[PDB]
Design a protein around this ligand. Structure first.
Ligand SMILES: CCCCCCCCCCCCCCCCCC(=O)OC(CO)CO
Ligand SMILES: CCCCCCCCCCCCCCCCCC(=O)OC(CO)CO
Lengths: 146, 147, 149, 145
Protein backbone atom coordinates (compact mmCIF):
# COMPACT_ATOMS: atom_id res chain seq x y z
CA UNK A 1 0.00 0.00 0.00
CA UNK A 2 1.59 3.31 1.04
CA UNK A 3 4.26 1.08 2.60
CA UNK A 4 5.20 -0.59 -0.66
CA UNK A 5 5.21 2.79 -2.40
CA UNK A 6 7.82 3.93 0.12
CA UNK A 7 9.81 0.75 -0.52
CA UNK A 8 9.48 1.41 -4.25
CA UNK A 9 10.88 4.92 -3.91
CA UNK A 10 13.83 3.67 -1.87
CA UNK A 11 14.52 1.39 -4.82
CA UNK A 12 14.43 4.37 -7.19
CA UNK A 13 16.73 6.37 -4.95
CA UNK A 14 19.34 3.65 -5.27
CA UNK A 15 18.67 3.03 -8.97
CA UNK A 16 19.02 6.69 -9.90
CA UNK A 17 22.55 6.57 -8.44
CA UNK A 18 23.79 3.55 -10.37
CA UNK A 19 23.10 1.28 -7.38
CA UNK A 20 20.72 -1.67 -7.51
CA UNK A 21 16.98 -1.21 -7.19
CA UNK A 22 16.82 -4.34 -5.05
CA UNK A 23 19.37 -3.08 -2.52
CA UNK A 24 17.26 0.07 -2.19
CA UNK A 25 14.01 -1.84 -1.77
CA UNK A 26 15.72 -4.13 0.74
CA UNK A 27 16.93 -1.16 2.78
CA UNK A 28 13.43 0.30 2.51
CA UNK A 29 11.73 -2.89 3.64
CA UNK A 30 14.12 -3.22 6.59
CA UNK A 31 13.19 0.32 7.66
CA UNK A 32 9.46 -0.42 7.95
CA UNK A 33 8.95 -4.19 8.37
CA UNK A 34 7.50 -5.83 11.48
CA UNK A 35 9.18 -7.58 13.16
CA UNK A 36 12.42 -5.74 12.45
CA UNK A 37 14.40 -8.92 11.80
CA UNK A 38 13.67 -10.81 8.61
CA UNK A 39 14.84 -14.20 7.38
CA UNK A 40 16.37 -14.67 3.94
CA UNK A 41 13.18 -16.38 2.80
CA UNK A 42 10.95 -13.66 4.24
CA UNK A 43 12.93 -11.04 2.31
CA UNK A 44 12.77 -13.02 -0.93
CA UNK A 45 9.00 -13.36 -0.58
CA UNK A 46 8.40 -9.77 0.50
CA UNK A 47 10.47 -8.38 -2.37
CA UNK A 48 9.58 -10.96 -5.04
CA UNK A 49 13.30 -11.61 -5.39
CA UNK A 50 15.62 -14.57 -5.89
CA UNK A 51 17.66 -15.89 -2.98
CA UNK A 52 20.76 -14.87 -4.93
CA UNK A 53 19.43 -11.35 -5.26
CA UNK A 54 18.73 -11.22 -1.54
CA UNK A 55 22.18 -12.53 -0.63
CA UNK A 56 24.22 -10.22 -2.85
CA UNK A 57 22.31 -7.08 -1.90
CA UNK A 58 22.26 -7.94 1.80
CA UNK A 59 26.04 -8.30 1.56
CA UNK A 60 26.27 -4.86 -0.02
CA UNK A 61 24.13 -3.25 2.70
CA UNK A 62 26.29 -4.90 5.37
CA UNK A 63 29.39 -3.48 3.63
CA UNK A 64 27.85 0.00 3.62
CA UNK A 65 27.10 -0.28 7.35
CA UNK A 66 23.29 -0.23 7.31
CA UNK A 67 22.23 -3.77 8.20
CA UNK A 68 23.56 -6.80 10.02
CA UNK A 69 23.31 -10.57 9.96
CA UNK A 70 22.05 -12.21 13.14
CA UNK A 71 21.19 -15.65 14.43
CA UNK A 72 18.01 -16.49 16.32
CA UNK A 73 18.19 -19.10 19.09
CA UNK A 74 16.65 -22.46 18.10
CA UNK A 75 16.46 -21.53 14.40
CA UNK A 76 18.96 -22.39 11.63
CA UNK A 77 17.77 -19.71 9.21
CA UNK A 78 19.76 -16.63 8.25
CA UNK A 79 18.33 -13.34 9.49
CA UNK A 80 19.02 -9.69 8.79
CA UNK A 81 18.02 -6.53 10.60
CA UNK A 82 18.58 -2.81 10.12
CA UNK A 83 21.34 -1.81 12.55
CA UNK A 84 20.58 0.49 15.48
CA UNK A 85 21.29 4.06 14.34
CA UNK A 86 21.95 2.61 10.90
CA UNK A 87 22.59 5.88 9.11
CA UNK A 88 25.17 6.87 11.72
CA UNK A 89 26.81 3.50 11.12
CA UNK A 90 26.66 4.31 7.42
CA UNK A 91 28.46 7.59 8.05
CA UNK A 92 31.17 5.76 10.01
CA UNK A 93 31.74 3.57 6.95
CA UNK A 94 31.91 6.70 4.81
CA UNK A 95 34.72 8.04 7.00
CA UNK A 96 36.69 4.88 6.21
CA UNK A 97 35.82 5.21 2.53
CA UNK A 98 37.11 8.81 2.51
CA UNK A 99 40.42 7.73 4.05
CA UNK A 100 40.71 5.11 1.34
CA UNK A 101 40.18 7.80 -1.30
CA UNK A 102 42.80 9.94 0.44
CA UNK A 103 45.29 7.10 0.05
CA UNK A 104 44.45 7.01 -3.68
CA UNK A 105 45.04 10.74 -4.01
CA UNK A 106 48.56 10.00 -2.72
CA UNK A 107 49.05 7.50 -5.51
CA UNK A 108 48.06 10.10 -8.08
CA UNK A 109 50.30 12.74 -6.53
CA UNK A 110 53.28 10.40 -6.68
CA UNK A 111 52.43 9.62 -10.33
CA UNK A 112 52.50 13.36 -11.10
CA UNK A 113 55.68 13.92 -9.08
CA UNK A 114 57.73 14.84 -12.17
CA UNK A 115 55.06 17.09 -13.69
CA UNK A 116 54.54 20.81 -12.96
CA UNK A 117 52.99 21.38 -9.49
CA UNK A 118 49.98 23.13 -11.03
CA UNK A 119 48.95 19.82 -12.57
CA UNK A 120 48.60 18.31 -9.09
CA UNK A 121 46.26 21.01 -7.79
CA UNK A 122 43.13 18.91 -8.32
CA UNK A 123 44.52 15.95 -6.37
CA UNK A 124 45.79 18.15 -3.53
CA UNK A 125 42.32 19.72 -3.25
CA UNK A 126 40.75 16.26 -3.18
CA UNK A 127 43.09 14.98 -0.47
CA UNK A 128 42.71 18.11 1.65
CA UNK A 129 38.90 18.20 1.43
CA UNK A 130 38.63 14.52 2.34
CA UNK A 131 40.92 14.91 5.37
CA UNK A 132 38.82 17.86 6.51
CA UNK A 133 35.46 16.13 6.04
CA UNK A 134 36.61 12.98 7.84
CA UNK A 135 37.25 15.07 10.93
CA UNK A 136 34.06 17.04 10.52
CA UNK A 137 31.92 13.89 10.30
CA UNK A 138 33.77 11.98 13.01
CA UNK A 139 33.49 14.90 15.45
CA UNK A 140 29.82 15.37 14.53
CA UNK A 141 28.94 11.71 15.04
CA UNK A 142 30.71 11.84 18.39
CA UNK A 143 28.58 14.73 19.57
CA UNK A 144 25.40 13.20 18.15
CA UNK A 145 25.87 10.01 20.18
CA UNK A 146 25.99 12.26 23.27
CA UNK B 1 52.21 4.20 -16.47
CA UNK B 2 52.07 5.23 -12.82
CA UNK B 3 49.23 7.53 -13.86
CA UNK B 4 47.45 4.59 -15.44
CA UNK B 5 47.75 2.65 -12.18
CA UNK B 6 46.07 5.51 -10.30
CA UNK B 7 43.26 5.58 -12.85
CA UNK B 8 42.68 1.82 -12.53
CA UNK B 9 42.67 2.04 -8.72
CA UNK B 10 40.00 4.74 -8.95
CA UNK B 11 38.05 2.30 -11.11
CA UNK B 12 38.45 -0.37 -8.46
CA UNK B 13 37.33 2.01 -5.73
CA UNK B 14 34.10 2.69 -7.58
CA UNK B 15 33.58 -0.93 -8.51
CA UNK B 16 34.08 -2.27 -5.00
CA UNK B 17 31.13 -0.02 -4.09
CA UNK B 18 28.59 -1.18 -6.67
CA UNK B 19 29.32 1.80 -8.92
CA UNK B 20 30.70 1.36 -12.44
CA UNK B 21 34.37 0.85 -13.03
CA UNK B 22 34.35 3.29 -15.91
CA UNK B 23 32.89 6.12 -13.81
CA UNK B 24 35.79 5.68 -11.41
CA UNK B 25 38.37 5.56 -14.18
CA UNK B 26 36.82 8.64 -15.78
CA UNK B 27 36.96 10.58 -12.51
CA UNK B 28 40.55 9.45 -12.04
CA UNK B 29 41.47 10.61 -15.51
CA UNK B 30 39.85 14.03 -15.05
CA UNK B 31 41.82 14.40 -11.81
CA UNK B 32 45.21 14.00 -13.53
CA UNK B 33 44.83 14.77 -17.23
CA UNK B 34 46.45 17.71 -19.04
CA UNK B 35 44.84 19.86 -20.30
CA UNK B 36 42.09 19.66 -17.69
CA UNK B 37 39.32 19.87 -20.27
CA UNK B 38 38.80 16.76 -22.42
CA UNK B 39 36.55 16.12 -25.41
CA UNK B 40 34.19 13.17 -25.50
CA UNK B 41 36.47 11.54 -28.07
CA UNK B 42 39.60 12.30 -26.07
CA UNK B 43 38.00 10.55 -23.08
CA UNK B 44 36.90 7.51 -25.06
CA UNK B 45 40.34 7.06 -26.63
CA UNK B 46 42.21 7.63 -23.34
CA UNK B 47 40.03 5.22 -21.40
CA UNK B 48 39.48 2.40 -23.93
CA UNK B 49 35.76 3.15 -23.76
CA UNK B 50 32.81 3.45 -26.12
CA UNK B 51 31.09 6.76 -26.76
CA UNK B 52 28.00 5.42 -24.99
CA UNK B 53 30.10 4.45 -21.99
CA UNK B 54 31.67 7.89 -21.80
CA UNK B 55 28.28 9.63 -22.14
CA UNK B 56 26.55 7.49 -19.51
CA UNK B 57 29.30 7.77 -16.93
CA UNK B 58 30.07 11.44 -17.54
CA UNK B 59 26.38 12.13 -16.85
CA UNK B 60 26.60 10.19 -13.59
CA UNK B 61 29.69 12.13 -12.52
CA UNK B 62 27.85 15.37 -13.27
CA UNK B 63 24.94 14.11 -11.15
CA UNK B 64 27.40 13.32 -8.34
CA UNK B 65 28.78 16.86 -8.57
CA UNK B 66 32.38 16.07 -9.53
CA UNK B 67 32.58 17.15 -13.17
CA UNK B 68 30.94 19.58 -15.56
CA UNK B 69 30.00 19.75 -19.22
CA UNK B 70 32.03 22.45 -20.95
CA UNK B 71 31.29 24.47 -24.06
CA UNK B 72 34.39 25.60 -25.95
CA UNK B 73 34.37 28.66 -28.21
CA UNK B 74 34.17 27.87 -31.92
CA UNK B 75 34.28 24.15 -31.23
CA UNK B 76 31.32 21.80 -31.81
CA UNK B 77 32.68 19.00 -29.62
CA UNK B 78 31.32 18.14 -26.20
CA UNK B 79 33.93 18.64 -23.47
CA UNK B 80 34.06 17.73 -19.80
CA UNK B 81 36.27 18.93 -16.97
CA UNK B 82 36.62 18.39 -13.24
CA UNK B 83 34.62 21.01 -11.36
CA UNK B 84 36.47 23.63 -9.35
CA UNK B 85 36.92 22.34 -5.79
CA UNK B 86 35.41 19.12 -7.07
CA UNK B 87 35.19 17.14 -3.84
CA UNK B 88 33.57 20.07 -2.04
CA UNK B 89 31.04 20.13 -4.88
CA UNK B 90 30.59 16.40 -4.41
CA UNK B 91 29.90 16.95 -0.72
CA UNK B 92 27.31 19.59 -1.58
CA UNK B 93 25.57 17.02 -3.72
CA UNK B 94 25.76 14.58 -0.77
CA UNK B 95 23.90 17.14 1.33
CA UNK B 96 21.20 17.23 -1.35
CA UNK B 97 21.10 13.42 -1.47
CA UNK B 98 20.70 13.34 2.32
CA UNK B 99 17.83 15.84 2.03
CA UNK B 100 16.17 13.57 -0.53
CA UNK B 101 16.51 10.57 1.81
CA UNK B 102 15.13 12.66 4.68
CA UNK B 103 12.12 13.45 2.48
CA UNK B 104 11.66 9.72 1.92
CA UNK B 105 11.92 9.01 5.65
CA UNK B 106 8.99 11.39 6.11
CA UNK B 107 7.03 9.43 3.49
CA UNK B 108 7.75 6.25 5.43
CA UNK B 109 6.72 7.86 8.70
CA UNK B 110 3.39 8.87 7.17
CA UNK B 111 2.86 5.34 5.86
CA UNK B 112 3.35 4.04 9.43
CA UNK B 113 1.19 6.79 10.95
CA UNK B 114 -1.47 4.33 12.13
CA UNK B 115 1.06 1.93 13.65
CA UNK B 116 2.54 2.07 17.16
CA UNK B 117 5.36 4.63 17.59
CA UNK B 118 7.89 1.86 18.22
CA UNK B 119 7.57 0.63 14.65
CA UNK B 120 8.64 4.08 13.40
CA UNK B 121 11.80 4.30 15.54
CA UNK B 122 14.10 3.26 12.67
CA UNK B 123 12.71 5.95 10.37
CA UNK B 124 12.82 8.62 13.08
CA UNK B 125 16.49 7.81 13.70
CA UNK B 126 17.14 8.02 9.95
CA UNK B 127 15.30 11.32 9.59
CA UNK B 128 17.01 12.90 12.61
CA UNK B 129 20.54 11.83 11.73
CA UNK B 130 20.18 13.08 8.16
CA UNK B 131 18.82 16.48 9.23
CA UNK B 132 21.68 16.81 11.73
CA UNK B 133 24.40 15.80 9.28
CA UNK B 134 23.04 18.00 6.48
CA UNK B 135 23.41 21.02 8.74
CA UNK B 136 26.81 19.97 10.09
CA UNK B 137 28.25 19.38 6.64
CA UNK B 138 26.75 22.54 5.15
CA UNK B 139 28.26 24.65 7.93
CA UNK B 140 31.62 22.90 7.61
CA UNK B 141 31.83 23.44 3.84
CA UNK B 142 31.09 27.12 4.43
CA UNK B 143 33.92 27.39 6.94
CA UNK B 144 36.20 25.49 4.56
CA UNK B 145 35.50 27.64 1.49
CA UNK B 146 36.74 30.51 3.66
CA UNK B 147 40.25 29.04 3.73
CA UNK C 1 -15.10 26.59 -10.31
CA UNK C 2 -11.94 25.54 -12.16
CA UNK C 3 -11.30 21.94 -13.07
CA UNK C 4 -8.07 20.00 -13.36
CA UNK C 5 -7.55 20.56 -17.06
CA UNK C 6 -7.75 24.34 -16.57
CA UNK C 7 -4.97 24.03 -13.98
CA UNK C 8 -2.89 21.82 -16.29
CA UNK C 9 -3.41 24.26 -19.17
CA UNK C 10 -2.35 27.19 -17.00
CA UNK C 11 0.77 25.36 -15.85
CA UNK C 12 1.64 24.89 -19.52
CA UNK C 13 1.21 28.63 -20.06
CA UNK C 14 3.38 29.39 -17.04
CA UNK C 15 6.22 27.36 -18.54
CA UNK C 16 5.84 28.65 -22.11
CA UNK C 17 5.74 32.28 -20.94
CA UNK C 18 9.24 31.70 -19.55
CA UNK C 19 10.72 30.14 -22.68
CA UNK C 20 10.26 26.61 -21.38
CA UNK C 21 8.11 24.06 -23.21
CA UNK C 22 4.34 24.05 -22.79
CA UNK C 23 4.37 20.25 -22.51
CA UNK C 24 6.79 20.33 -19.57
CA UNK C 25 4.43 22.66 -17.72
CA UNK C 26 1.39 20.52 -18.52
CA UNK C 27 3.25 17.38 -17.46
CA UNK C 28 4.24 18.93 -14.12
CA UNK C 29 0.68 20.12 -13.63
CA UNK C 30 -0.71 16.67 -14.40
CA UNK C 31 1.67 14.99 -11.93
CA UNK C 32 0.54 17.46 -9.26
CA UNK C 33 -3.13 16.45 -9.51
CA UNK C 34 -3.33 12.97 -11.05
CA UNK C 35 -4.61 9.91 -9.20
CA UNK C 36 -2.86 7.62 -8.71
CA UNK C 37 0.22 9.76 -8.24
CA UNK C 38 2.37 7.37 -10.26
CA UNK C 39 1.73 7.38 -14.02
CA UNK C 40 3.11 5.28 -16.87
CA UNK C 41 4.68 6.87 -19.95
CA UNK C 42 1.72 5.63 -22.00
CA UNK C 43 -0.83 7.04 -19.54
CA UNK C 44 0.88 10.43 -19.63
CA UNK C 45 0.98 10.52 -23.42
CA UNK C 46 -2.73 9.66 -23.52
CA UNK C 47 -3.85 12.18 -20.90
CA UNK C 48 -1.89 15.06 -22.45
CA UNK C 49 -2.52 14.18 -26.11
CA UNK C 50 1.25 14.02 -26.52
CA UNK C 51 3.81 11.88 -28.34
CA UNK C 52 5.96 9.35 -26.50
CA UNK C 53 8.96 11.42 -27.55
CA UNK C 54 7.42 14.54 -26.04
CA UNK C 55 6.75 12.79 -22.74
CA UNK C 56 10.27 11.34 -22.64
CA UNK C 57 12.18 14.56 -23.34
CA UNK C 58 10.02 16.69 -21.06
CA UNK C 59 10.05 14.13 -18.26
CA UNK C 60 13.84 14.20 -18.46
CA UNK C 61 13.76 17.98 -18.03
CA UNK C 62 11.51 17.83 -14.98
CA UNK C 63 13.78 15.18 -13.44
CA UNK C 64 16.78 17.48 -13.99
CA UNK C 65 14.84 20.37 -12.42
CA UNK C 66 14.29 18.10 -9.40
CA UNK C 67 10.49 17.91 -9.49
CA UNK C 68 9.74 14.35 -10.59
CA UNK C 69 11.24 10.87 -10.42
CA UNK C 70 11.43 7.79 -12.59
CA UNK C 71 10.13 4.55 -11.10
CA UNK C 72 10.28 0.96 -12.32
CA UNK C 73 9.03 -2.45 -11.19
CA UNK C 74 10.92 -5.70 -11.84
CA UNK C 75 7.85 -7.58 -13.06
CA UNK C 76 6.76 -4.58 -15.12
CA UNK C 77 8.67 -3.12 -18.07
CA UNK C 78 6.65 0.07 -18.43
CA UNK C 79 8.31 3.34 -17.40
CA UNK C 80 6.55 5.18 -14.56
CA UNK C 81 6.94 8.74 -13.32
CA UNK C 82 5.82 10.39 -10.15
CA UNK C 83 6.07 13.78 -8.52
CA UNK C 84 8.83 13.69 -5.94
CA UNK C 85 8.02 13.95 -2.26
CA UNK C 86 8.38 17.60 -1.22
CA UNK C 87 8.87 18.34 -4.94
CA UNK C 88 9.23 22.11 -4.81
CA UNK C 89 11.70 21.92 -1.93
CA UNK C 90 13.65 19.46 -4.06
CA UNK C 91 13.37 21.91 -6.94
CA UNK C 92 14.77 24.67 -4.74
CA UNK C 93 17.72 22.43 -3.80
CA UNK C 94 18.51 22.09 -7.49
CA UNK C 95 18.43 25.90 -7.66
CA UNK C 96 21.09 26.03 -4.93
CA UNK C 97 23.27 23.88 -7.17
CA UNK C 98 22.47 26.08 -10.16
CA UNK C 99 23.54 29.18 -8.25
CA UNK C 100 26.80 27.49 -7.20
CA UNK C 101 27.51 26.65 -10.84
CA UNK C 102 26.83 30.27 -11.83
CA UNK C 103 29.19 31.44 -9.10
CA UNK C 104 31.92 29.25 -10.59
CA UNK C 105 31.18 30.80 -13.98
CA UNK C 106 31.52 34.29 -12.51
CA UNK C 107 35.00 33.26 -11.37
CA UNK C 108 35.86 32.24 -14.95
CA UNK C 109 34.73 35.65 -16.13
CA UNK C 110 36.70 37.47 -13.44
CA UNK C 111 39.87 35.64 -14.42
CA UNK C 112 39.27 36.47 -18.09
CA UNK C 113 39.07 40.15 -17.09
CA UNK C 114 42.21 39.98 -14.95
CA UNK C 115 44.09 42.49 -17.13
CA UNK C 116 41.13 44.86 -17.48
CA UNK C 117 40.45 47.87 -15.24
CA UNK C 118 38.75 46.68 -12.07
CA UNK C 119 35.67 48.83 -12.88
CA UNK C 120 34.95 46.50 -15.82
CA UNK C 121 34.67 43.54 -13.43
CA UNK C 122 32.14 45.20 -11.11
CA UNK C 123 29.17 43.39 -12.70
CA UNK C 124 30.78 39.97 -12.23
CA UNK C 125 31.79 40.74 -8.64
CA UNK C 126 28.19 41.74 -7.88
CA UNK C 127 26.93 38.52 -9.51
CA UNK C 128 29.40 36.38 -7.56
CA UNK C 129 28.63 38.07 -4.23
CA UNK C 130 24.83 37.96 -4.61
CA UNK C 131 24.89 34.29 -5.58
CA UNK C 132 27.18 33.33 -2.67
CA UNK C 133 24.86 35.13 -0.26
CA UNK C 134 21.63 33.67 -1.69
CA UNK C 135 23.04 30.14 -1.77
CA UNK C 136 23.66 30.39 1.97
CA UNK C 137 20.30 32.02 2.63
CA UNK C 138 18.35 29.38 0.68
CA UNK C 139 20.39 26.48 2.03
CA UNK C 140 19.72 27.61 5.61
CA UNK C 141 16.06 28.22 4.86
CA UNK C 142 15.45 24.77 3.36
CA UNK C 143 17.16 23.19 6.35
CA UNK C 144 14.80 25.06 8.65
CA UNK C 145 11.82 24.25 6.43
CA UNK C 146 12.41 20.50 6.84
CA UNK C 147 11.84 20.89 10.58
CA UNK C 148 8.44 22.10 9.41
CA UNK C 149 6.23 24.98 8.33
CA UNK D 1 39.30 33.92 -23.15
CA UNK D 2 36.34 36.27 -22.83
CA UNK D 3 34.56 34.32 -25.54
CA UNK D 4 35.23 31.22 -23.42
CA UNK D 5 33.22 32.60 -20.48
CA UNK D 6 30.49 33.70 -22.90
CA UNK D 7 30.33 30.24 -24.47
CA UNK D 8 30.16 28.65 -21.01
CA UNK D 9 27.21 30.86 -20.06
CA UNK D 10 25.51 29.66 -23.24
CA UNK D 11 26.08 26.13 -21.95
CA UNK D 12 24.63 26.86 -18.53
CA UNK D 13 21.50 28.17 -20.21
CA UNK D 14 21.18 25.28 -22.66
CA UNK D 15 21.58 22.79 -19.80
CA UNK D 16 18.58 24.32 -18.03
CA UNK D 17 16.50 24.08 -21.22
CA UNK D 18 16.87 27.74 -22.18
CA UNK D 19 18.49 29.01 -25.38
CA UNK D 20 22.19 29.02 -25.83
CA UNK D 21 21.91 32.52 -27.28
CA UNK D 22 20.19 33.94 -24.18
CA UNK D 23 23.08 32.60 -22.11
CA UNK D 24 25.72 33.99 -24.44
CA UNK D 25 23.93 37.34 -24.48
CA UNK D 26 23.81 37.49 -20.67
CA UNK D 27 27.46 36.48 -20.55
CA UNK D 28 28.40 39.17 -23.04
CA UNK D 29 26.51 41.87 -21.13
CA UNK D 30 28.34 40.81 -17.94
CA UNK D 31 31.78 41.46 -19.44
CA UNK D 32 31.47 43.85 -22.39
CA UNK D 33 32.89 47.37 -22.52
CA UNK D 34 31.11 49.80 -22.72
CA UNK D 35 28.39 48.18 -20.60
CA UNK D 36 25.76 49.39 -23.07
CA UNK D 37 25.56 47.61 -26.43
CA UNK D 38 23.47 48.40 -29.47
CA UNK D 39 21.36 45.77 -31.21
CA UNK D 40 23.85 45.68 -34.08
CA UNK D 41 26.85 45.55 -31.75
CA UNK D 42 25.30 42.54 -30.04
CA UNK D 43 24.55 40.74 -33.31
CA UNK D 44 28.11 41.37 -34.46
CA UNK D 45 29.73 40.41 -31.15
CA UNK D 46 27.81 37.15 -30.86
CA UNK D 47 27.63 36.26 -34.56
CA UNK D 48 23.87 36.20 -34.06
CA UNK D 49 20.76 37.16 -36.00
CA UNK D 50 18.74 40.28 -35.23
CA UNK D 51 15.63 38.22 -34.48
CA UNK D 52 17.67 36.07 -32.12
CA UNK D 53 19.01 39.15 -30.36
CA UNK D 54 15.50 40.67 -30.12
CA UNK D 55 13.86 37.52 -28.76
CA UNK D 56 16.54 36.67 -26.24
CA UNK D 57 16.99 40.23 -25.05
CA UNK D 58 13.27 40.35 -24.32
CA UNK D 59 13.59 37.21 -22.22
CA UNK D 60 16.54 38.60 -20.25
CA UNK D 61 14.48 41.75 -19.64
CA UNK D 62 11.56 39.62 -18.44
CA UNK D 63 13.89 37.70 -16.12
CA UNK D 64 15.12 41.00 -14.64
CA UNK D 65 18.78 40.93 -15.70
CA UNK D 66 19.02 43.59 -18.39
CA UNK D 67 17.29 46.75 -19.57
CA UNK D 68 16.54 48.38 -22.90
CA UNK D 69 17.68 51.99 -23.07
CA UNK D 70 18.03 55.02 -25.30
CA UNK D 71 21.13 57.14 -25.73
CA UNK D 72 20.89 60.86 -26.40
CA UNK D 73 21.83 61.79 -29.97
CA UNK D 74 21.61 58.18 -31.11
CA UNK D 75 18.82 56.35 -32.97
CA UNK D 76 19.95 52.83 -32.07
CA UNK D 77 18.35 50.53 -29.51
CA UNK D 78 20.74 49.73 -26.66
CA UNK D 79 20.79 47.15 -23.91
CA UNK D 80 22.71 47.02 -20.66
CA UNK D 81 22.99 44.76 -17.65
CA UNK D 82 20.96 46.19 -14.79
CA UNK D 83 22.66 47.42 -11.61
CA UNK D 84 22.80 44.53 -9.10
CA UNK D 85 21.40 42.43 -11.93
CA UNK D 86 21.22 39.15 -10.04
CA UNK D 87 19.37 40.76 -7.14
CA UNK D 88 16.96 42.13 -9.73
CA UNK D 89 16.71 38.61 -11.16
CA UNK D 90 15.85 37.33 -7.69
CA UNK D 91 13.14 39.97 -7.35
CA UNK D 92 11.59 38.66 -10.55
CA UNK D 93 11.86 35.08 -9.26
CA UNK D 94 9.83 36.09 -6.22
CA UNK D 95 7.13 37.46 -8.51
CA UNK D 96 7.23 34.25 -10.58
CA UNK D 97 6.86 32.15 -7.43
CA UNK D 98 3.81 34.19 -6.41
CA UNK D 99 2.25 33.59 -9.82
CA UNK D 100 2.99 29.88 -9.53
CA UNK D 101 1.52 29.81 -6.03
CA UNK D 102 -1.65 31.40 -7.42
CA UNK D 103 -1.82 28.47 -9.85
CA UNK D 104 -1.46 26.01 -6.98
CA UNK D 105 -4.54 27.70 -5.51
CA UNK D 106 -6.42 27.05 -8.76
CA UNK D 107 -5.40 23.39 -8.57
CA UNK D 108 -6.56 23.16 -4.97
CA UNK D 109 -9.98 24.53 -5.89
CA UNK D 110 -10.15 22.11 -8.81
CA UNK D 111 -9.66 19.25 -6.33
CA UNK D 112 -12.05 20.60 -3.67
CA UNK D 113 -14.50 17.71 -4.06
CA UNK D 114 -11.81 15.04 -3.96
CA UNK D 115 -10.31 13.44 -0.83
CA UNK D 116 -7.88 15.83 0.89
CA UNK D 117 -5.03 13.33 0.51
CA UNK D 118 -5.19 13.94 -3.23
CA UNK D 119 -4.37 17.62 -2.61
CA UNK D 120 -1.25 16.95 -0.52
CA UNK D 121 1.13 17.63 -3.40
CA UNK D 122 -0.48 20.97 -4.20
CA UNK D 123 -0.46 21.94 -0.50
CA UNK D 124 3.30 21.17 -0.30
CA UNK D 125 3.86 23.23 -3.43
CA UNK D 126 1.89 26.21 -2.12
CA UNK D 127 3.49 26.04 1.34
CA UNK D 128 7.05 25.92 -0.03
CA UNK D 129 6.54 28.72 -2.53
CA UNK D 130 5.08 31.00 0.16
CA UNK D 131 7.95 30.17 2.52
CA UNK D 132 10.61 30.84 -0.11
CA UNK D 133 8.94 34.06 -1.30
CA UNK D 134 9.09 35.35 2.26
CA UNK D 135 12.69 34.17 2.78
CA UNK D 136 14.06 35.61 -0.44
CA UNK D 137 12.26 38.96 -0.03
CA UNK D 138 13.65 39.29 3.49
CA UNK D 139 17.13 38.29 2.32
CA UNK D 140 17.17 40.79 -0.56
CA UNK D 141 16.14 43.62 1.75
CA UNK D 142 18.92 42.80 4.19
CA UNK D 143 21.45 42.49 1.35
CA UNK D 144 20.67 45.89 -0.17
CA UNK D 145 21.35 47.31 3.30
C1 LIG E 1 37.55 0.29 2.84
C2 LIG E 1 36.57 1.40 3.18
C3 LIG E 1 35.13 0.87 3.18
C4 LIG E 1 34.15 1.99 3.53
C5 LIG E 1 32.71 1.60 3.17
C6 LIG E 1 32.51 1.51 1.65
C7 LIG E 1 31.92 2.80 1.03
C8 LIG E 1 30.76 3.37 1.83
C9 LIG E 1 29.87 4.25 0.92
C10 LIG E 1 30.69 4.82 -0.25
C11 LIG E 1 29.84 5.75 -1.10
C12 LIG E 1 30.38 5.78 -2.53
C13 LIG E 1 30.78 7.20 -2.89
C14 LIG E 1 31.26 7.26 -4.35
C15 LIG E 1 31.81 8.65 -4.67
C16 LIG E 1 33.02 8.93 -3.79
C17 LIG E 1 32.98 10.35 -3.26
C18 LIG E 1 33.47 10.38 -1.84
O1 LIG E 1 33.43 9.46 -1.04
O2 LIG E 1 33.74 11.66 -1.43
C19 LIG E 1 32.92 12.75 -1.87
C20 LIG E 1 31.53 12.56 -1.22
O3 LIG E 1 30.80 13.69 -1.59
C21 LIG E 1 33.62 14.02 -1.36
O4 LIG E 1 33.08 15.02 -2.13
C1 LIG F 1 3.69 37.60 -14.65
C2 LIG F 1 4.56 37.36 -13.41
C3 LIG F 1 5.90 37.80 -13.80
C4 LIG F 1 6.96 37.32 -12.91
C5 LIG F 1 8.37 37.22 -13.53
C6 LIG F 1 8.44 36.11 -14.49
C7 LIG F 1 9.89 35.66 -14.82
C8 LIG F 1 10.17 34.19 -14.43
C9 LIG F 1 11.54 33.88 -14.10
C10 LIG F 1 11.67 32.84 -13.07
C11 LIG F 1 11.15 31.54 -13.44
C12 LIG F 1 12.11 30.70 -14.29
C13 LIG F 1 11.38 29.51 -14.87
C14 LIG F 1 11.32 28.33 -13.87
C15 LIG F 1 9.99 27.47 -13.71
C16 LIG F 1 10.22 26.27 -12.78
C17 LIG F 1 10.81 26.71 -11.36
C18 LIG F 1 12.37 26.70 -11.40
O1 LIG F 1 13.08 27.36 -12.11
O2 LIG F 1 12.90 25.48 -11.17
C19 LIG F 1 13.16 24.90 -10.09
C20 LIG F 1 14.42 24.14 -10.67
O3 LIG F 1 14.93 23.49 -9.80
C21 LIG F 1 13.42 25.90 -9.00
O4 LIG F 1 12.49 25.77 -8.00
Amino acid sequence: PDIMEFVEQMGGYFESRSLTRLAGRLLGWLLVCDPERQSSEELATALAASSGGISTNARMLIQFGFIERLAVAGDRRTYFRLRPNAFAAGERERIRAMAELQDLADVGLRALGDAPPQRSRRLREMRDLLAYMENVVSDALGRYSQ
